[PDB]
Amino acid sequence: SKRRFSSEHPDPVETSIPEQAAEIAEELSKQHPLPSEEPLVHHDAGEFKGLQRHHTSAEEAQKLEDGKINPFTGREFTPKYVDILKIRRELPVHAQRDEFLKLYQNNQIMVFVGETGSGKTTQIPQFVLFDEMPHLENTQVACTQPRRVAAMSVAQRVAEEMDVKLGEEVGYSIRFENKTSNKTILKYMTDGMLLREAMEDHDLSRYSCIILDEAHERTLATDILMGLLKQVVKRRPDLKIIIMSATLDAEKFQRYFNDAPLLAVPGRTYPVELYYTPEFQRDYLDSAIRTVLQIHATEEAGDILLFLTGEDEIEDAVRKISLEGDQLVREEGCGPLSVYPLYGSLPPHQQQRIFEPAPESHNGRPGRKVVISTNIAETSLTIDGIVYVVDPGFSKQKVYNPRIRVESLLVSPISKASAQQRAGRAGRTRPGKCFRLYTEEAFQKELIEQSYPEILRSNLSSTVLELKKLGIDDLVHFDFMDPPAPETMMRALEELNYLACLDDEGNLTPLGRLASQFPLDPMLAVMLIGSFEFQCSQEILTIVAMLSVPNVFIRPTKDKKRADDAKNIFAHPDGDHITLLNVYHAFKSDEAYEYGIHKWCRDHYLNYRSLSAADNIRSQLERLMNRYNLELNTTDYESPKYFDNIRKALASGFFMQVAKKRSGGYITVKDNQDVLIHPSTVLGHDAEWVIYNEFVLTSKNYIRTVTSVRPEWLIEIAPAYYDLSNFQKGDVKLSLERIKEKVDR
Ligand SMILES: Nc1ncnc2c1ncn2[C@@H]1O[C@H](COP(=O)(O)OP(=O)(O)O)[C@@H](O)[C@H]1O
Ligand SMILES: [Mg+2]
Ligand code: NI
């Protein structure tokens, strides 16, 4: 039966300030409706005249590839293209081009499996372009990657293989980073971005072929896309789907996709000798560094791939290995050693450096390259010339606590399957070696066989909103390859209703619709959207952008006091979220610019990479706010309301991540969890109630990035949530009872 609302138990949608803001924006949007998307353009001067769609062969395409003129653009092929062409033609998938074409031509969905390095991501979509000729039928081909870095780097490489400009006929799309145009035929993109395109066009009508790549990684976005496309093909006989995977055991995929056929590429990996440590290695970074330097000093020529876990750790390793490499050249006459980082947030000009040839030695001992990478390099891309892998056995992995309902990103041991994939990267060129920084027994007995798919390790708040925007009513029966626990889904539905993104019958509100237009977690989107109602949308836009990048404050272990003093320049007491606004504002100041911005960040213990990323995100979010008619406004800094307005806007999104100082640590409003303020913040005595950005789970529970709030504001802004009937007996409830009493008198 329809839920009943009253003053005692009010309607979360009728009492949401962001919902008011979205209703205003929506009416403004109706006054001037958005034009439809720019149409595709293409080139056609008869070059494909001799080819028939879905009846082409490898020979016909080779004739076109060998021709004088690039058939996709009408410009003469360069000499560089021709040299690239000869080399990629030795890739293993080329030997099965006709077998692949036949499967593609005769089936709507197919599964394609092959080892990393075999040429799946770069070659197959080019094979499809010849047979499908998508640009001659007003369409594109999409190829999704779980990893940003893979999509960006392969798109750059495939633009060169196809002899076209990046962003034109070959382009990429990542959240906040678009490199496509009306000319784009082949779009590499993260799986999350094709999911966002589907939210706007449920049938994905722009694509005639969609290739879901690296499916063995089983990311959440990839799982949703699989479930969606298994329905879209029923409506779209003109859509073909290719599922590509590294894991040569793809039985489960074929079954899930209606017994689709499988094309398997036989492996061509050279033998790799495995080395283990005799004992447990307690401190793996220094063991890794020693191992890389030993290899460099004693092994024959061949590059090194070191797997680490995250960007600060990799930059620290790059610095130490570079220094120690240089010491070896000068002290022992080792060959030159170049050292490159690879991790998720790296800028594309820096991604490309990993493919540079090793330096030439002028002294008789081998010059060598070390790439220090996350598990991006486990299966998603290949650096030619690797012969040695160092595997500390760890990666950063999302874990989920069902009761607490909290996702945590933690460094933990990898699976045996991941360890096998890491070792395999040493055998792409010739017999290689893999140095595992753990015992053969830890590998045989202690590592789990296989990591669980991401959907079983996620809060599903974004996922539920996406599925709703996609027009899925019955979330429980959505056809996931591995369904999540139904309770996780139900908790997500309830949160979204409290945020007023869904009403109580599970339908999208104007706020839910508008929130779905922002590539942000729902709490952030709702905070942003509502913020012009609190007269601080300029400031909240900054804050949301800063919450979308990592912690910008550098704190070296042996330089804490100077790093802490620098942060205090920007820190707002009882207001970590305002600290974020202060640092971004200083970063964008004329003064920092005149100081020289790179130097300015270093001297102030700030990460330029992170700030620069926030600045781009802020520009892209601003463009969405303009597109969807969310006013950019602000309040005089000297207004007595200036900081109140910011705290209120924050509360409008984050009212469910609130903690109260214990009467007799803090206690969370949601689930009554005992927590400590994370040591990165010390609050004053006036911070009885705070909003936190993050719940941190180590041996104890902390909340991190905390700003104080008046509890009266919480009741005012989120009365359906702060309904005392909702609360268990205890400290929080008591304190809230007293606050309500007093708000009346
Ligand atoms: N970014 C790149 N720059 C230069 N060469 C590359 C690049 N990426 C891949 N290659 C080469 O192309 C081959 C095919 O790579 P790719 O299509 O990524 O294979 P897969 O997707 O099957 O793991 C690799 O063996 C490597 O030789
Ligand atoms: Mg690939
Ligand atoms: Ni059922």
In the chain, the amino acid numbered 450 is: Q
381 CA closest ligand 1 atom index: 18
Residue 427 marked in a binding site: no
Please tell me what resolution, in angstroms, this structure has.
1.9
| Ligand whose nearest atom lies closest to the CA of 87 | 1
Q: Please give the span between the terminal C-alpha atoms of the chain, in angstroms, as a whole number.
A: 36
Q: How far apart are CA 444 and CA 377, in angstroms?
A: 23
* Overall fold of domain 452-498: Arc Repressor Mutant, subunit A (1.10.10)
Say if ligand 1 is within 6 A of residue 121 CB: yes
Cβ count near 99 (within 10 Å): 13
> What residue spans define the domains of the chain?
1-36+499-745, 37-268, 269-451, 452-498
Q: Where does the chain break, by residue before each gap (C–N > 2.5 Å)?
A: 664
Q: How many Å apart are CA 318 and CA 367, to the nearest integer? A: 17
Minimal CA–CA distance to 130: which of 204, 215, 239, 209? 209
Q: What is the 3-state secondary structure (H, E, C) of 645-668?
A: HHHHHHHHHHCCCEEEECCCCEEE
Mutate to test the pocket of ligand 1, among 91, 122, 216, 353 (most ligand atoms within 8 A of CB): 122
The answer, yes or no, to whether any atom of ligand 1 lies below 6 A from the CB of 157, is: yes
For 329, half-sphere exposure in the C-beta direction (CA atoms, 13 angstrom radius) is 17
Are 37-268 and 452-498 in the same CATH fold?
Answer: no
List the determination method. Answer: X-ray
The response to whether residue 56 sits with its C-beta less than 6 Å from ligand 1 reads no
DSSP string, 239-262: -EEEEEES-S--HHHHHHTTS--E
- Of 87, 268, 350, 384, best ligand 1 pocket probe by most atoms within 8 Å of the beta carbon: 384
Sequence-separated (6 or more) residues with CB below 8 Å from residue 447: 393, 413, 414, 415, 416, 419
Q: 37-268: which CATH topology?
A: Rossmann fold (3.40.50)
Query: What are the CA-CA distances from residue 39 to residues 42, 184, 187, 236, 690 (Å)?
Result: 10, 11, 15, 20, 49
Query: Contact at 8 Å (CB) between 353 and 338?
Result: no
Please tell me the number of Cα atoms within 13 Å of 680 on its side-chain side.
Answer: 22
Number of H helices, E strands in the chain: 28, 21
Say if residue 85 is exposed, middle or buried (CB neighbours under 10 Å; 0-12, 13-18, 19+).
Answer: middle
What is the CA(656)–ligand 2 centre distance, in A? Answer: 40
Cβ contacts of 726-734, under 8 Å, gap ≥ 24: 728/672, 730/667, 730/672, 731/660, 731/662, 731/663, 731/667, 732/660, 732/667, 732/669, 732/672, 734/663
User: What is the radius of gyration, based on Cα positions, of the chain?
Assistant: 27
The fold adopted by the segment(s) 269-451 is: Rossmann fold (3.40.50)
Determine the Cα–Cα distance for residues 224 and 202; give it in Å rounded to an integer.
13
